[PDB]
Amino acid sequence: DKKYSIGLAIGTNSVGWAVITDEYKVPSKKFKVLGNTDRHSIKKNLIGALLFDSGETAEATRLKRTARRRYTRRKNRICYLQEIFSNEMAKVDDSFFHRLEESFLVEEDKKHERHPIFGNIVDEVAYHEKYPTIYHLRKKLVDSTDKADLRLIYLALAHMIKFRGHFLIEGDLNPDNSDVDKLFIQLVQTYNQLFEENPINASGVDAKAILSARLSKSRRLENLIAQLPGEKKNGLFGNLIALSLGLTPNFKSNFDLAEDAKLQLSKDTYDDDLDNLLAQIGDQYADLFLAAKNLSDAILLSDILRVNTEITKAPLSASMIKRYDEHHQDLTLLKALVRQQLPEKYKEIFFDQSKNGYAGYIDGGASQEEFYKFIKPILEKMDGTEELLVKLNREDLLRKQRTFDNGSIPHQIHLGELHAILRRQEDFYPFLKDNREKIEKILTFRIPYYVGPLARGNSRFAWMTRKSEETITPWNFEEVVDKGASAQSFIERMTNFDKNLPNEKVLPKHSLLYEYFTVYNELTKVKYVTEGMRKPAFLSGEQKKAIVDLLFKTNRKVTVKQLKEDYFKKIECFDSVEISGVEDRFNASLGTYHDLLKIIKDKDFLDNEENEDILEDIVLTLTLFEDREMIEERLKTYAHLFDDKVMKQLKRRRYTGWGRLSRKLINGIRDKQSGKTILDFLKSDGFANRNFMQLIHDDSLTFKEDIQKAQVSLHEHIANLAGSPAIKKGILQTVKVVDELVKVMGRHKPENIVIEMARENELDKAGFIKRQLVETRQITKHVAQILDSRMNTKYDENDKLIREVKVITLKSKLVSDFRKDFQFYKVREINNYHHAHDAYLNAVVGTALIKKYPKLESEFVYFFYSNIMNFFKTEITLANGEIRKRPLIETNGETGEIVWDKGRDFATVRKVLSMPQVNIVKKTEVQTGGFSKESILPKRNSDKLIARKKDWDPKKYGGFDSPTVAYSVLVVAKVEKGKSKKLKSVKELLGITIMERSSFEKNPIDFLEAKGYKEVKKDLIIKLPKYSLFELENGRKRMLASAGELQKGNELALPSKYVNFLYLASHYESPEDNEQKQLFVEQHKHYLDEIIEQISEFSKRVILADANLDKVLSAYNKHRDKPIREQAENIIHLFTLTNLGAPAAFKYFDTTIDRKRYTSTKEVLDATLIHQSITGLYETRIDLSQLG
RNA sequence: AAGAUGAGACGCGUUUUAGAGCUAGAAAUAGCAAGUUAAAAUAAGGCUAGUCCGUUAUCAACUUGAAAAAGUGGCACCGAGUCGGUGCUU
DNA sequence: CGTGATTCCAGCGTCTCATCTTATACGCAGC
DNA sequence: CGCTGCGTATATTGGAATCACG
């Protein structure tokens, strides 16, 4: 048997594989070909590449799922509101809700009157006259006190609930506090009263302009400070301003506090932080802060709301109505001005829905920005146009009610408006008064981000824990959903498990047990050297306890000097002691211990072991939750041990982060023979003081065996890796390709497996060698480990894996240098063979390296310089112009095996690179994704429209188009051809769309009979996924891009000379070498027309693009006078014409050639279909012309 | 510092319908109006009936296994336009 | 009256939170 | 030995429509 090696090159969209025997020669083997064709054996080289579409992140799918949930919940909220309105609306208007529901149907299909709101034309007209927009209805309901019809109330409430704005501001906003300057003046006055010693000159400073400017918070703060030379941005007044702006000021400095007084108004915890300020400095500032809070409100209302507050308590409705009136006035003025001045453009602006005029801005498709762009030169051309220009410069001209920039509106405004409306109308409708709280809750309720979807055990994203078997409505959310359990699971389901105990769960970062473990583990390897000691000795358990009590339990940090003085000098009376294993200070510290000692003020409580679990239940509680209410609820169980002040301090205290070792791995498991745990051993390990690594790697202790036993699917193992989904797909395809290759070579595993991943998108000499050899990226290490585990499964009796297969890792830079140094150039656009070529080179390089320098295996699985690939060079430069020669045959001195034959290896490499047949295979994959193009098309008399619902005929209501076909199906059956319904046998591809895929797979016979096919041969059905391969004739092979489109599937085996000439001429990436290359470029410029001739021949044989090829030839003849480099680059562009895959347009100089599309699939019905294996070696050819 | 994964939310957009378009012109076609908004859906859909799930990952062919997956393909040499030819076994 | 050429077009803009993970250095400890 | 950890620092391509057009 011939032992071989496998080279692999992974990439986002390609996986190159190569099999090399000795002398670095790709074998050529005959493979049997199945099918009903006539061939029985085909020759194939053992090198190739696999092509596939890059993997997609779940980001888009997650966004779509979230949108689905949001729409579902919105509809549920509407349903709740209607249910509240059910009986009363039925008393008032029996079918009002029904008219609301069928509003989308056309008049033919409506079961009620076409007017939803009133069910009659006259009332609808009158209503539309009275309230031009819904905001008029809202303003009327808020302001008027007269009893209103329940339908209008429902419409206003539904408009509020359905569109409620964001929840980025919590608490009460007090929208009446809209005084941008008066509140500022009041705050300044209060500050001056509290700081009469340091008054502030607020005169001459416009608070409104600075604070309501459409700029960043920092910029406006700096602008305000600039007008106050005596005050700074970091000053107390400056920090109050920053807090009003929504920043995070640090009051610790201004108030000289030890606690970091970080306060932000938006945060729910703000009030509690204010309470902290109510416990350190005093209450005199409270009103001050309140004023600042009020100031903040005005700022938040400044940009969103531009209206007087005294006129009404619904500022949003007033602002919308004012904007509508401004729009109306500007529209009337603009119409008058256009008719007076430019009557010709009047039709273009007020009638052309296709243009970007007002007709297109309203009725057609045109944004506000687009409309402004269209209209601005028109307004400048006209005269008497100043107000409109000012508004356009302000982006406040002809604005609509429902614009894109309404997302800044806090839900508090809607809540206040709804509350006001309910209060106004509660005197007329008892149920509104009774269910006011319910509607307020519906408006203000959210599913908390830490609860997750309210599933019932049917979801792969859900962790919500219930309490009772009922329906989670917003009014009984707390009664049903267990907030504590759900919030704990929301953290636990995504936390890393212990590496040594995969079933167990890691401990928090600041656990007292974890800190103790770190302290003891660091203390175990501590040695002390004194005069009376011959040899340094480890610290005894009693000594360790004494040190911890003296230092670790008394100071937030422990230093080397503190250890030397406070223990050896004080207790041991050691005046000279040296400590090894630690420098500077000690990284481990009892930060949690000192913090809890500060808070609860009971050292004995901490020192009691019986409290340990409780202590853990505190720290975990201080890590699981971020809401202070949840933390308080959890700590209420332990509120009996500590005073309310301690409870408040604990609620304030909240640290995050998680450790890396579980509790069972520290204090859970106990050694069988000794009866001691890991913590027990760390507290007393005799005199050896074995640390955690020694304890877990000790063959004499049960811990290692327990770890091994507890430590006991390729796809799942890959899905848990860290990397982009495309790279993970590439890794999986690489592994399956390795499996296929092993099956190919007679099930004899290769000696070496070199792996290189392209890209995401004396001691010094030894270090440089290590840098050039090791692969810094860890995903490469993961892939190498996976391949080593899969290929190697022979662990000897000494508990060591027999390395029958050596996984090597290599970096792209070395191979690229090899290519560019030995003129083994590549062009990305010519063809895909480079992928396989790269793999081959990788294998060769790797193999040669492991042959030449076996001792370096540990670096990636001798000389005086740091170079490692230099021995391939036939001639070596000594960096001083002293060109010398290496031995012609390079061999390892110790072994004596020949590792490089310059007289044969270079020629063999050239031949392998020049081999015309390369196993390029496009990974056939059933396509999935959106059912079609999402854009909803208007009703047309076309059959390509796709229904958006069951009863919505696309001829009337419009719908989707351009469906995506997953895989085609070749059907041989009969149809009712002609008027006589003659059953003519037919053979054509039928497109299986993603929408219809399930129906077809459930019952193909009925699905095919539904589309008009009769007498279907069930066994003759052949499934052709996307990129299925067909051979028509004369070697013309095409990939089935869809049910009705083909792709070029043949590659151009360009001679290496042409490739090198193209690389050198175009400057794709030693002056004498450059001059020689230029001379060769000119010499092959004499040959340049040969490249064009080869392109034309390949196009005639396989492409059949007559018009495009003729235009290419004409343009080339026209541009023959162009410089050689320009022509070379343009021909590199020309390579797009014949490159594999979907045809693409290109540009030869100034002539643009569009893509030729093979839109007919009639020919492949009589061609030979090919099933290429994963590596493409095992091929199954079926002659489709023998069917039918 | 960067990137990935998941959860909770907003604002649009896009379609059909509701916004009586008026005058004259046999009709077609011109002139004159208005235009800002609202409802429903926003993947068809499924049952596992939940404020659940539906665009990520997986997938050559034949047999088996629900399916994850398992089984299924001789070697050497010469050359190379997509792989051919020659010798042994079969 | 089908058929090759030519052209048009595709849902999108934010916010909050959590879990991470890498990415590379440094120091300590090791079986 | 190489790993094991502990800590610190931060556009594209298929569909679809239309247009000569023999």
Task: Give dist(CA A1112, CA A1127) in Å, integer.
Answer: 12
Contact residues for A146 (Cβ-Cβ < 8 A; gap 6+): none
By C1' distance from the Cα of A725, the closest nucleotide is B57
Estimate in Å the CA A944 to C1' C14 gap, whole number. 35
Tokens of A230: 């005596």
Task: Give dist(CA A1186, CA A1167) in Å, integer.
Answer: 10
By C1' distance from the Cα of A1180, the closest nucleotide is B61
Task: Give dist(CA A1161, CA A1155) in Å, integer.
Answer: 17
- Residue at minimum CA to C1' distance from nucleotide C7: A1154
**Cβ-based neighbour number of residue A853 at 10 Å:** 19
Nearest to A993 by CA among A923, A930, A922: A930
Q: Are strands A1151-1153 and A1146-1148 parallel, antiparallel or unpaired?
A: antiparallel
CA angle A42–A44–A50, rounded 5-degree value: 120
Question: Length of chain A, please?
Answer: 1188
Q: Alpha carbon A15 to chain centroid distance?
A: 23
By C1' distance from the Cα of A695, the closest nucleotide is C31
Strand D: which nucleotides have any atom within 7 A of a protein Cβ?
1-8, 12-17
The β-bridge partners of A891 are A898
Query: Are A992 and A1008 contacting, i.e. CB atoms less than 8 angstroms apart?
Result: no
Query: Are A731 and A777 contacting, i.e. CB atoms less than 8 angstroms apart?
Result: no
Estimate in Å the CA A859 to C1' D2 gap, whole number. 9
Helix (H, G, I), strand (E, B), or coil: what is residue A986?
strand
Q: Long-range contacts: A433-440, Cβ < 8 Å, 24+?
A: A435/A84, A438/A84, A438/A475, A439/A81, A439/A84, A439/A157, A440/A415
Q: Which whole-number Å values give the CA distances from A505 to A521, A631, A662, A767, A977, in the listed order? A: 21, 21, 6, 39, 68
Question: To 10 degrees, the CA torsion angle through A1129, A1132, A1136, A1138?
Answer: 140
Segment (H or E) for A121: helix A121-130
Helix (H, G, I), strand (E, B), or coil: what is residue A955?
helix
Strand B: which nucleotides have any atom within 7 A of a protein Cβ?
3-20, 31-61, 68-69, 72-85
Tokens of A76: 């549920």
Task: Give dist(CA A977, CA A993) in Å, integer.
Answer: 24
Estimate in Å the CA A775 to C1' B58 gap, whole number. 29
Estimate in Å the CA A255 to C1' C16 gap, whole number. 31
Estimate in Å the CA A943 to C1' B46 gap, whole number. 27
Tokens of A1093: 């001739």
Helix (H, G, I), strand (E, B), or coil: what is residue A280?
coil
Residue type, A523: L
Estimate in Å the CA A626 to C1' C18 gap, whole number. 10
Task: Give dist(CA A987, CA A975) in Å, integer.
Answer: 10
Q: Alpha carbon A558 to chain centroid distance?
A: 43
The β-bridge partners of A51 are A14, A922
For residue A247, give the DSSP letter: -
Tokens of A829: 């656009």
Q: Are strands A806-810 and A752-757 parallel, antiparallel or unpaired?
A: parallel
A587: CB within 7 A of chain C nucleic strand:
yes
CA Rg, chain A, in Å? 39
Query: Are A681 and A689 contacting, i.e. CB atoms less than 8 angstroms apart?
Result: no
Task: Give dist(CA A138, CA A319) in Å, integer.
Answer: 12
Task: Give dist(CA A508, CA A687) in Å, integer.
Answer: 31
Q: Which whole-number Å values give the CA distances from A946 to A735, A935, A942, in the listed order? A: 41, 11, 10
Contact residues for A714 (Cβ-Cβ < 8 A; gap 6+): A732, A735, A790
Estimate in Å the CA A882 to C1' B83 gap, whole number. 46
Task: Give dist(CA A72, CA A64) in Å, integer.
Answer: 12
Task: Give dist(CA A823, CA A807) in Å, integer.
Answer: 28
Find the farthest-apart pair of alpha carbons in chain A and give their distance in angstroms, rounded.
Answer: 117
Segment (H or E) for A875: strand A875-877
Phi, psi (deg, nearest 5) at residue A2: -95, 115
Q: Which whole-number Å values give the CA distances from A31 to A20, A486, A635, A1037, A1178, in the listed order? A: 18, 59, 72, 20, 7
Nearest to A833 by CA among A1062, A1028, A1053, A1049: A1053
Query: Are A803 and A750 contacting, i.e. CB atoms less than 8 angstroms apart?
Result: no
By C1' distance from the Cα of A944, the closest nucleotide is D16
For residue A946, give the DSSP letter: B
Q: Which whole-number Å values give the CA distances from A815 to A173, A482, A758, A822, A836, in the listed order? A: 64, 58, 10, 11, 13
Estimate in Å the CA A727 to C1' B58 gap, whole number. 15
The residue whose two tokens read 């009866």 is A675
Nearest to A99 by CA among A112, A86, A87, A90: A112
Estimate in Å the CA A936 to C1' B44 gap, whole number. 14
**Cβ-based neighbour number of residue A1047 at 10 Å:** 19
Contact residues for A879 (Cβ-Cβ < 8 A; gap 6+): none
Task: Give dist(CA A343, CA A341) in Å, integer.
Answer: 6
A834: CB within 7 A of chain C nucleic strand:
no
Contact residues for A46 (Cβ-Cβ < 8 A; gap 6+): A18, A19, A20, A26, A27, A28, A29, A744
Task: Give dist(CA A908, CA A19) in Å, integer.
Answer: 14
Estimate in Å the CA A419 to C1' B32 gap, whole number. 46
Strand C: which nucleotides have any atom within 7 A of a protein Cβ?
4-7, 9-25, 27-31
Handedness of CA A939, A943, A947, A950 (dihedral sign): positive
Task: Give dist(CA A947, CA A962) in Å, integer.
Answer: 12
By C1' distance from the Cα of A964, the closest nucleotide is D14
By C1' distance from the Cα of A924, the closest nucleotide is B60
Nearest to A50 by CA among A24, A6, A27, A18: A18
Judge residue A128's burial from the number of C-beta atoms within 10 Å of its C-beta, 0-12 exposed, 13-18 middle, 19 or more buried. Answer: exposed
Q: Are strands A1037-1040 and A933-937 parallel, antiparallel or unpaired?
A: unpaired
Segment (H or E) for A411: helix A411-425
Task: Give dist(CA A440, CA A434) in Å, integer.
Answer: 12
Query: Does residue A520 come out as left (phi exceeding 0), alpha (psi in the -120 to 50 range) or beta?
Result: alpha
- Residue at minimum CA to C1' distance from nucleotide B9: A166
Tokens of A763: 């001691």
The residue whose two tokens read 């959890």 is A634
The residue whose two tokens read 């001639």 is A875
Estimate in Å the CA A366 to C1' B14 gap, whole number. 12
By C1' distance from the Cα of A63, the closest nucleotide is B55
Tokens of A173: 């906003």
Query: Are A1107 and A1155 contacting, i.e. CB atoms less than 8 angstroms apart?
Result: no
A496: CB within 7 A of chain C nucleic strand:
yes
Task: Give dist(CA A925, CA A1029) in Å, integer.
Answer: 12
Tokens of A1062: 């193209």
Contact residues for A434 (Cβ-Cβ < 8 A; gap 6+): none
Q: Which whole-number Å values give the CA distances from A159 to A90, A430, A610, A845, in the listed order? A: 20, 22, 58, 69
Task: Give dist(CA A760, CA A780) in Å, integer.
Answer: 11
Query: Does residue A978 come out as left (phi exceeding 0), alpha (psi in the -120 to 50 range) or beta?
Result: left
For residue A1139, give the DSSP letter: S
Task: Give dist(CA A268, CA A1159) in Å, integer.
Answer: 61
Segment (H or E) for A972: strand A965-977
By C1' distance from the Cα of A699, the closest nucleotide is C31
Estimate in Å the CA A743 to C1' B77 gap, whole number. 24
Estimate in Å the CA A158 to C1' C2 gap, whole number. 55
The β-bridge partners of A756 are A9, A810
Estimate in Å the CA A6 to C1' B65 gap, whole number. 31
Nearest to A440 by CA among A417, A463, A465: A417
Estimate in Å the CA A87 to C1' B43 gap, whole number. 35
Task: Give dist(CA A467, CA A461) in Å, integer.
Answer: 19
Task: Give dist(CA A1048, CA A1139) in Å, integer.
Answer: 7
Tokens of A75: 């509809």
Task: Give dist(CA A16, CA A838) in Å, integer.
Answer: 7
A727: CB within 7 A of chain C nucleic strand:
no
Nearest to A989 by CA among A957, A965, A1006, A1010: A965
Task: Give dist(CA A133, CA A127) in Å, integer.
Answer: 10
Q: Alpha carbon A1060 to chain centroid distance?
A: 40
Contact residues for A155 (Cβ-Cβ < 8 A; gap 6+): A117, A134, A137
Tokens of A704: 């290692």
- What stretches of A269-310 show up as alpha helix (H) in DSSP? 270-277, 286-304
Contact residues for A738 (Cβ-Cβ < 8 A; gap 6+): A6, A8, A17, A753, A787, A790, A791
Nearest to A350 by CA among A341, A338, A340, A366: A338
By C1' distance from the Cα of A965, the closest nucleotide is D14
Residue type, A645: K
Estimate in Å the CA A316 to C1' D11 gap, whole number. 42
Estimate in Å the CA A131 to C1' B25 gap, whole number. 36
Tokens of A88: 């009363």
Task: Give dist(CA A1055, CA A911) in Å, integer.
Answer: 10
**Cβ-based neighbour number of residue A584 at 10 Å:** 7
A1154: CB within 7 A of chain C nucleic strand:
yes
A166: CB within 7 A of chain C nucleic strand:
yes
Task: Give dist(CA A946, CA A966) in Å, integer.
Answer: 16
Tokens of A913: 């690179």
Helix (H, G, I), strand (E, B), or coil: what is residue A716?
helix
Estimate in Å the CA A342 to C1' B25 gap, whole number. 27
By C1' distance from the Cα of A932, the closest nucleotide is B43
- Residue at minimum CA to C1' distance from nucleotide D5: A693
Q: Which whole-number Å values give the CA distances from A1188 to A319, A970, A987, A1020, A1025, in the listed order? A: 73, 11, 7, 9, 21
Query: Are A356 and A348 contacting, i.e. CB atoms less than 8 angstroms apart?
Result: no
By C1' distance from the Cα of A1108, the closest nucleotide is C5
Tokens of A1153: 């050639």
Q: Which of residues 758-777 of A touch strand C (CB under 7 A)?
A: 776-777
Helix (H, G, I), strand (E, B), or coil: what is residue A391?
helix
The β-bridge partners of A933 are A961
Task: Give dist(CA A441, CA A220) in Å, integer.
Answer: 37
Handedness of CA A603, A605, A611, A613 (dihedral sign): negative
Q: At what angle do helices A612-624 and A512-524 cross, to 10 degrees?
A: 110
**Cβ-based neighbour number of residue A509 at 10 Å:** 16
Query: Are A868 and A860 contacting, i.e. CB atoms less than 8 angstroms apart?
Result: no
Tokens of A1121: 């006078």
Query: Are A854 and A896 contacting, i.e. CB atoms less than 8 angstroms apart?
Result: no
A682: CB within 7 A of chain C nucleic strand:
no
- Residue at minimum CA to C1' distance from nucleotide B47: A458
Query: Are A474 and A442 contacting, i.e. CB atoms less than 8 angstroms apart?
Result: yes
Contact residues for A471 (Cβ-Cβ < 8 A; gap 6+): A480
Report DSSP letters for A1000-1044, one per residue: HHH-HHHHHHHTT-BS--STT-EEEEBTEEEE-STT-EEEE-SSS
Q: Where are the beta strands (DSSP E) in A391-508?
A: 506-508
- Residue at minimum CA to C1' distance from nucleotide C14: A407
Tokens of A389: 């220009």
Helix (H, G, I), strand (E, B), or coil: what is residue A721?
coil
CA angle A522–A524–A529, rounded 5-degree value: 105
Task: Give dist(CA A504, CA A513) in Å, integer.
Answer: 16
Q: Which whole-number Å values give the CA distances from A158 to A81, A89, A315, A349, in the listed order? A: 7, 14, 19, 35
Estimate in Å the CA A29 to C1' B28 gap, whole number. 78
Query: Are A1008 and A989 contacting, i.e. CB atoms less than 8 angstroms apart?
Result: no
Q: Are strands A919-922 and A47-51 parallel, antiparallel or unpaired?
A: parallel
Residue type, A1124: I
- What stretches of A131-235 show up as alpha helix (H) in DSSP? 134-143, 150-162, 182-194, 207-211, 217-226
Contact residues for A129 (Cβ-Cβ < 8 A; gap 6+): none
Nearest to A524 by CA among A392, A313, A693: A693
Estimate in Å the CA A337 to C1' B32 gap, whole number. 17
Task: Give dist(CA A184, CA A186) in Å, integer.
Answer: 5
Task: Give dist(CA A89, CA A342) in Å, integer.
Answer: 52
By C1' distance from the Cα of A995, the closest nucleotide is B44
By C1' distance from the Cα of A693, the closest nucleotide is C30
Estimate in Å the CA A840 to C1' B15 gap, whole number. 55
- Residue at minimum CA to C1' distance from nucleotide B12: A404
For residue A490, give the DSSP letter: H
**For chain A, counts of helices (H) and of strands (E):** 50, 29
Q: What protein residues sit with their CB closer than 7 Å to strand D?
A: A 499-500, 509, 514, 518, 521, 587-588, 659-661, 693, 781, 858-859, 940, 942-944, 961-963, 965, 991, 1041-1045, 1047, 1141-1142, 1144, 1155, 1157
Task: Give dist(CA A865, CA A85) in Å, integer.
Answer: 87
Query: Does residue A922 come out as left (phi exceeding 0), alpha (psi in the -120 to 50 range) or beta?
Result: beta
Tokens of A675: 């009866």
Which structural technique was applied? cryo-EM
